[PDB]
Design a protein around this ligand. Structure first.
Ligand code: ZN
Lengths: 50, 46, 93
RNA sequence: UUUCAAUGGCCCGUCUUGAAACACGGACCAAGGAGUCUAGCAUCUAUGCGAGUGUUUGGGUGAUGAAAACCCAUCCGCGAAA
RNA sequence: GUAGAGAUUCUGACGUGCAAAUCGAUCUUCAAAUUUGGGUAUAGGGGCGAAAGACUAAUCGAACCAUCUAGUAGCUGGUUCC
RNA sequence: UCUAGUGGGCCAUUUUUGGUAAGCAGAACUGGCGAUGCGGGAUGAACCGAACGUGAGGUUAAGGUGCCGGAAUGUACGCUCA
RNA sequence: UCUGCCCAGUGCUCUGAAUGUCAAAGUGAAGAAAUUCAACCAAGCGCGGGUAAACGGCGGGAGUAACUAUGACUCUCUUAAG
RNA sequence: CGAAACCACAGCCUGGGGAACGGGCCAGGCAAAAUCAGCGGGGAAAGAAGACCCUGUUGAGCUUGACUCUAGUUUGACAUU
RNA sequence: UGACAUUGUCAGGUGGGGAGUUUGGCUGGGGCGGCACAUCUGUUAAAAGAUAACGCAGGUGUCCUAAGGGGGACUCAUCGAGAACAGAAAUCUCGAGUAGAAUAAAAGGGUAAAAGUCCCCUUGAUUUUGAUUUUCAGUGUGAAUACAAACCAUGAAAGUGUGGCCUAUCGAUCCUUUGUUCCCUCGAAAUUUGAGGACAGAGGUGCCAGAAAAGUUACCACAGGGAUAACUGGCUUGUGGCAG
RNA sequence: CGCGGGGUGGAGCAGCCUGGUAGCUCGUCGGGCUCAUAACCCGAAGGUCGUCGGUUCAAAUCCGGCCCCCGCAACC
RNA sequence: AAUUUUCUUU
């Protein structure tokens, strides 16, 4: 037979389109400030991630 | 066509075999409903 | 066919070259020992990659089998083999 | 040699029971074009020797001029026994 | 409905053609799932496929190149002087 | 003793079998073609005669003697008008 | 707007409660050793399920309702099912 | 100015026989140079070692509870320990 | 998280996801059907022998410790006439009775103080060697015939018996297994296990001189075949029609 | 082939291991009663426990062989 | 628990 589309989705053509994305949405590195107290940040932008 | 997919081929568009395939299926035949505990319309359950 | 458990027939033994009484039993195939040279050769051939290396019979004509009688000398302790025609039922006594 | 006259004469090769075939190949010409060599075997024939037969695996005349011819020892192959 | 992109019918022209797919009329679509240049990635039991076994350099129900390879053929053809 | 080719057959008389029958299929005997040229049946593998080196002369076979065409528009007795 | 009935079959899943299996290794019974029995590993199944907006399956015979025609209602027949 | 396809040799018909529809064979009808433009009856016209069917102890694409295997996957034993 | 898991080796299961390969022959084309593929009887078979068709009628892969062997006794199937019976020739009788019965199974042949029925005894349905017949290439297999060397059975004995009254009833190499011998070998010398040999059987190939084998191609390919089908003609007239 | 399981009235099922007496349901048959129709009633039978052999004071049972069916596993 | 039916008239 022939390799099916599911097997062909291993990468290459079927990679994610991430040019317009603004960055990974990870929270933060767990540091001493977050482990023993708190840290105050100010939100400055709210953007749409394609 | 049969060369393309396990569901391809036949004089009518039909799967021919059950679409519920075992969990430990080889790649290329693990198509349809993989390791389906149940199938069909359900009316009321948890 | 019915065969008596005892028959008086010619004994080909060295110490009994006359007609003596022999006990009659049906011969049966042996237990197919694994130390036979053919068995060792077959196992060596089958080992490794290549699949089945010898023919395997699949057609089963001739439902019956030939009957082999094992005559045993009462005192001479000599065993002789006789062949009967093909039959579907065999019985002793 | 040409031509005429009388009579006879179907296009070659091939497969085939059967080809002129409405069976296949062939427009023409020149050159090329297909049972060879080798390891064996079998029969027959010729030659040499003969209960023996086989010098060239090898060594020498060797240097001349020597892929040749010539000479030389022990094994060994086949045969002499099944 | 123009440009652009396609190709329904005439089963028109041509069909040793202008052309190994063209020409004319007619027709579909034409502000988006649109068309397209350049760069780049996916390579042969692999790629890619809005899925026709379609496309992958005039080659696709498994591309091209060289080698194994002078592959095998119980089949076809041929096989040279009296 | 060694070895080649052959291992698709076919036609006619007679004896037949299966079929409505067949230029059909399958058997037996013999003679042939295949591999058989020549004379005759206008033409033809099998039918008739006859089996073939190159020629001369003679005589025939089967078949013919109105012309084509070599040979009596011969002889005798009858029948027939389509 | 509906998507009716069906888990007997084949697929799927599940607890392995079947313990009903049984390859390597390990334990012991013999032998002087090479060499047999018990036990074990999961199964998948035998069960349960799901149930078709998953593979697939889903007729006919009879009494008939004022007859017997009828062909609504009814009941068994394969059942997975009118 | 200037080809190509095709080409055993060639080319008027009837009947017969024949590999069962002949241009050639047999018997007849006949038969006079060299040419032009059309034409589509015939040459069983041309192309292409029938794509239909059968045979081959020839293949390939595809399918499956065909035979033999295999990537993978599952479980166990041994080592890491 | 943690001596688990991962990884390495081996083993069991699964695995058209993938690989390789097969998927008979005859055949009035092939396919379906069937076995005419190994065999037997009558006929086709044309009075020596041989002789085909998917010609006709049918059989066989079994069965029998007796349905084998020997000996002895009797004669069968039917028909007529009888007895009580009560249709029943049930049974028991006398005559006629060339086989019109039986002989395991198809058919043909053979058989009457038997080859049939009954009774008695037995295991010649035993070991071994050569010769011969049929199918034949005078190879094999199967089957069969007449002898020989032993041991037997049965009869008083002459004799008969090496399976079934005769014509069918079955199987190579390799491998496995059994039996056999004061049997041979394991090649440095020994003992015991084990293994390998020679001889005689069995386990089977029915496609029966004996491969281990499922389909599709309406996407298809190659070498060929008019040995072979559809078309193409030709031949034939079984049907229909038409004419006496 | 190796192992394991089953066969029981006309039908479908227990009993076997807990040898001492073969039972249940469906079904058939017998009714007089619900004044009279349906409907109903209780009981009765119906089994070589597939075949053969062995055992014991005694076998469907326990054991072994055979016939049929089924499941697993293997198959020069 | 369980209890269906009583033709058209005199
Ligand atoms: Zn003895």
């Amino acid at each position: 037979g022939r390799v099916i589309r599911a097997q062909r989705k291993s990468g290459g053509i079927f990679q994610a389109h991430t040019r317009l994305r603004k960055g990974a949405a990870q929270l933060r590195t767990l540091d001493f400030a977050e482990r023993h107290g708190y840290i105050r940040g100010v939100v400055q932008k709210i953007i749409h991630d394609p | 066509n049969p060369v393309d997919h396990p569901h391809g081929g036949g004089n009518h568009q039909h799967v021919g075999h059950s679409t519920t395939v075992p969990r430990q299926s080889a790649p290329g035949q693990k198509v349809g409903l993989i390791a389906a505990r149940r199938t069909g319309l359900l009316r009321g359950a948890a | 066919v019915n065969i008596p458990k005892t028959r008086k027939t010619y004994c080909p033994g060295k110490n009994c070259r006359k007609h003596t009484v022999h006990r009659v039993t049906q011969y049966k195939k042996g237990p197919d020992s694994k130390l036979a040279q053919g068995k060792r050769r077959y196992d060596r051939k089958q080992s490794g990659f290549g699949g089945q290396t010898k023919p395997v019979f699949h057609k089963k004509a001739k439902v019956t089998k030939k009957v082999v009688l094992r005559l045993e000398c009462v005192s001479c302790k000599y065993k002789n083999q006789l062949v009967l025609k093909r039959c579907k039922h065999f019985e002793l006594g």
